[PDB]
Amino acid sequence: SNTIRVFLPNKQRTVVNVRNGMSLHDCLMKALKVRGLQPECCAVFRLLHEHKGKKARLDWNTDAASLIGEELQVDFLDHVPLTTHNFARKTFLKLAFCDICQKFLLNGFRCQTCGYKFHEHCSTKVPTMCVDWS
Amino acid sequence: MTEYKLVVVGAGDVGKSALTIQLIQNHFVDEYDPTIEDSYRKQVVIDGETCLLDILDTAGQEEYSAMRDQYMRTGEGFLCVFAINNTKSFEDIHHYREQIKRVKDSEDVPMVLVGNKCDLPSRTVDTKQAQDLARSYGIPFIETSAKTRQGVDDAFYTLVREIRKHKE
Ligand SMILES: Nc1nc2c(ncn2[C@@H]2O[C@H](COP(=O)(O)OP(=O)(O)NP(=O)(O)O)[C@@H](O)[C@H]2O)c(=O)[nH]1
Ligand SMILES: [Cl-]
Ligand SMILES: [Mg+2]
Ligand SMILES: [Zn+2]
Ligand SMILES: [Zn+2]
Numbered sequence A: 001s002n003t004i005r006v007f008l009p010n011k012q013r014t015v016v017n018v019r020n021g022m023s024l025h026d027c028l029m030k031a032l033k034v035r036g037l038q039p040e041c042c043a044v045f046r047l048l049h050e051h052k053g054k055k056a057r058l059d060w061n062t063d064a065a066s067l068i069g070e071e072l073q074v075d076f077l078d079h080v081p082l083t084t085h086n087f088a089r090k091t092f093l094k095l096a097f098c099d100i101c102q103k104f105l106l107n108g109f110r111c112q113t114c115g116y117k118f119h120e121h122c123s124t125k126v127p128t129m130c131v132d133w134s
Numbered sequence B: 001m002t003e004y005k006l007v008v009v010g011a012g013d014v015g016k017s018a019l020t021i022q023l024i025q026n027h028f029v030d031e032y033d034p035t036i037e038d039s040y041r042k043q044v045v046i047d048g049e050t051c052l053l054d055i056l057d058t059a060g061q062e063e064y065s066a067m068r069d070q071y072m073r074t075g076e077g078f079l080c081v082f083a084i085n086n087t088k089s090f091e092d093i094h095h096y097r098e099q100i101k102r103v104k105d106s107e108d109v110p111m112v113l114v115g116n117k118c119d120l121p122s123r124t125v126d127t128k129q130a131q132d133l134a135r136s137y138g139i140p141f142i143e144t145s146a147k148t149r150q151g152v153d154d155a156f157y158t159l160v161r162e163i164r165k166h167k168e
């Protein structure tokens, strides 16, 4: 009953059950980290069901209980170097090694953006967010 | 890239969240953390095709049964999870499949029976029982341990392959 519905980056969401005294940050750290998202790379917003403004930024240390029954959204900060991978299949003619298991890689997959290279059966261990400082 | 909407269902304490987080973040913790509603997106390569899994992890209890109804309506495939050391969670699988059939108006729904916690020695549901249940339902059975990652990819890959067959 003491819950908040929180939309999260990359079209994800969580419903948090608020323990009194906890901040928004306390309530959402795990949800973000388990999705491979750093809290330091994000901002939290209150959704405004009114025109001329879709959302209003909130302080991360805001008391969570005070927003029970509202809808919040966590978004990436402007221009953070995080994106989604762009996987392509790749045959490695020269000897190559998987970035996940360090075994030989002959037929595999490779992110065209960050260069992560891996076996098909290692793909679920590739980090969720692609880091692009190129 | 094709997106696959998956829903993880089953009784409380059977490891639905642990299985999902193992898949998403390659990580296992022993902490019990009650789920109300959690969706995750993750790219995966399955049979040489990159696809996007959109995974919904649900609460098992009757309080949220009307929420589950809506989740299940748009779900394309279902992981029905029980714990191999909890016979009640195994028999309760039947209630979740009945619930899914109600919102899908079909018996032909992509579905995998998942027997989790296979690392534990206190096993009360044996492999043969679960295969028989899965056979009577016409769906695959996969043994998993979210603790060791055993069979975790296999459960989600098998469900995607069931969805692909169904969409033929
Ligand atoms: N040994 C072992 N423990 C497991 C395994 N999977 C989950 N557990 C443990 O079982 C407990 C419940 O796990 P959890 O994923 O939260 O279960 P749940 O199905 O999400 N329950 P709920 O519906 O309340 O959200 C935790 O202590 C977790 O560590 C497994 O494969 N092996
Ligand atoms: Cl090797
Ligand atoms: Mg859970
Ligand atoms: Zn990448
Ligand atoms: Zn590998």
Ligand SMILES: [Zn+2]
Binding pocket: B091, B092, B095
């Ligand atoms: Zn029952």
